[PDB]
């Protein structure tokens, strides 16, 4: 209250306003902590999932490299065989 | 004076409270940015994953065709 209060009354109004603001902070903290913990857990999971996608990525790049080389060698054999028969 | 002391104690507890909250919010926002960046990196990886799988399927099918073409040609040439 902004009305002119007497010390005895202002004091009581101030103490109530403090407990209130305190409970508000206790609530803001509890919620932020909860959200913080869920974020920790999720990031751990995401990181683990990302490292797995990287691992799969590599296996595939390798598979592609292996197939690209067998492909070129095949096109060269076809060209060699074709020229020999005349196509 | 006695009530003024009760006020001070409440304030010391309050300061500590704001301190724990400020700290918790700072770590939280940090974790949020790390969380969004990871989500995006995971999305990137999926998209690149598909491209590669398609390339593999394509190369595997060309490979088999080429092997059949090489087989056909050898039978004509006499090679074994």
Curated annotation (Swiss-Prot), chain B:
Signal sequence region: none
Compartments in which it is found: Cytoplasm, Myofibril
Function: Muscle contraction.
Record note on quaternary structure: Muscle myosin is a hexameric protein that consists of 2 heavy chain subunits (MHC), 2 alkali light chain subunits (MLC) and 2 regulatory light chain subunits (MLC-2).
Family membership noted in the UniProt record: Belongs to the TRAFAC class myosin-kinesin ATPase superfamily. Myosin family.
Protein name: Myosin heavy chain, striated muscle
Organism this protein belongs to: Argopecten irradians
Part of the full-length chain shown: 840 to 885 of 1938
């Amino acid at each position: 209250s902004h009305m002119p209060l007497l010390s005895i009354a202002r004091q009581e109004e101030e103490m109530k306003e403090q407990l209130k603001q305190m409970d508000k902070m206790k609530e803001d903290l509890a919620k932020t902590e909860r959200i913080k913990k869920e974020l920790e857990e999720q990031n751990v999971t995401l990181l683990e999932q990302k490292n797995d996608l990287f691992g799969s990525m590599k296996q595939l790049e390798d598979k592609v490299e292996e197939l690209l080389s067998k492909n070129y060698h095949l096109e060269n054999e076809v060209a060699r065989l074709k020229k020999l028969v005349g196509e």
